[PDB]
């Protein structure tokens, strides 16, 4: 239905805003990675986690 399509569009849009925010915080060097991984690994885990969360 229409409203469901709009809820999916907003669900993906919120995840896109999250990936953009984590992207800006990563480009500004304001996010410290956890123990065991580097900045790029934690960033990719956050982006992939947000995208899979929005898809689910």
């Amino acid at each position: 239905d229409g409203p469901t399509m709009r809820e999916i569009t907003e669900t993906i849009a919120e995840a896109k805003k999250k990936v953009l925010d984590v992207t800006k915080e990563a480009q500004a060097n304001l996010l410290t990675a956890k123990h065991g991984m580097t900045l790029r690994e934690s960033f990719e885990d956050n982006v992939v986690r947000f995208l899979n969360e929005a898809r689910d």
């Binding site: 993906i12 896109k16 990936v19 953009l20 992207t23 990563a26 960033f43 982006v47 995208l51």
Partner: protein, 56 residues
Amino acid sequence: LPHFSKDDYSPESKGFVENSYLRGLTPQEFFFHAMGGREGLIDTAVKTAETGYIQR
């Protein structure tokens, strides 16, 4: 792909397929989906080729 800018970490350019199979897919998404399909076929082929030797 040579259709995006350099040093782009946006999720859309990194492989996220926000479209669905009902409305079709874009070329830059169909290419990555083809990569995933070929990877699936190769992985299944290797898993079978080793599964036979393990079975023997």
